């Protein structure tokens, strides 16, 4: 009925890191504006924000104990598989269910209306939005987002993972801690850890939707900046 000092420690560090990275990614992008500059400018305002997110995410993945111990090659495989999913998770934390827009700057809120004027298809927008809604309802707290992101990164079955066995083993104490933590902070909800894992299943499918969207961009004569391009094309 209580965590271990180790588990208490694992969680705090992870929370500290997220706070550290979420701050540090706050220290300016192509502002939000119809013309043909204006439109391929909104494309700009988004992809740039996407860059920032990817950074905060790589930044955060390095501080997750045990990650930088893998081959540099596996490190690439993992972030490549993980980044969009961690992005959608973070996006969920920014979601207002009352008005159905996501916040990104501080007082800047985007409707799915806006997502559209920014070059994104509805086949993409509505799923993102509905995941953000459902995920939001689940009411994860700091410890839980943090553990869940660590757990997602150490997914052995990602494409190209050269050392799955090491990866599965890194994940374990993380799945273990999440398991305990949810047992203690919500004892009678014998299902929360399950509901939590169920979200990874949803992310995996979302990953593929995201692929659809990225590939849809080509025929549209629109390029991703090299970083995004680097991990998505």
């Amino acid at each position: 009925m209580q965590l271990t000092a180790a588990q208490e420690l694992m969680i705090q560090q992870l929370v500290a890191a997220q706070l550290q990275c979420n701050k540090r990614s706050f220290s300016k992008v192509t502002p939000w504006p119809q013309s043909r500059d204006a439109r391929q400018q909104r494309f700009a305002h988004f992809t740039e924000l996407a860059i920032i997110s990817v950074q905060e995410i790589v930044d955060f993945a390095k501080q997750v104990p045990g990650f930088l111990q893998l081959g540099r090659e596996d490190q690439i495989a993992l972030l490549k598989a993980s980044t969009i999913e961690i992005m959608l998770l973070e996006t969920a934390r920014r979601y207002n269910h009352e008005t159905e827009c996501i916040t990104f700057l501080k007082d800047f809120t985007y409707s799915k209306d806006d997502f559209h004027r920014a070059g994104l298809q509805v086949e993409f927008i509505n799923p993102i939005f509905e995941f953000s809604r459902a995920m939001r309802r689940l009411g994860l707290d700091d410890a839980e987002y943090a553990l869940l992101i660590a757990i997602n990164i150490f997914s052995a079955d990602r494409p190209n993972v050269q050392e799955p066995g090491r990866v599965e083993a890194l994940q374990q104490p993380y799945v273990e801690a999440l398991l305990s933590y949810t047992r203690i902070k919500r004892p009678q909800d014998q299902l929360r850890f399950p509901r939590m894992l169920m979200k990874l299943v949803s992310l995996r499918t979302l990953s593929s939707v995201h692929s659809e969207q990225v590939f849809a961009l080509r025929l549209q004569d629109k390029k991703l900046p090299p970083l995004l391009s680097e991990i998505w094309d």
């Binding site: 950074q55 790589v58 930044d59 390095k62 540099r72 690439i76 090299p226 970083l227 680097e230 991990i231």
Partner: peptide, 12 residues
């Protein structure tokens, strides 16, 4: 392959 990312991993 994967240049800029490889950079971010190495920074610091």
């Amino acid at each position: 392959d994967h240049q800029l990312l490889r950079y971010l991993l190495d920074k610091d």
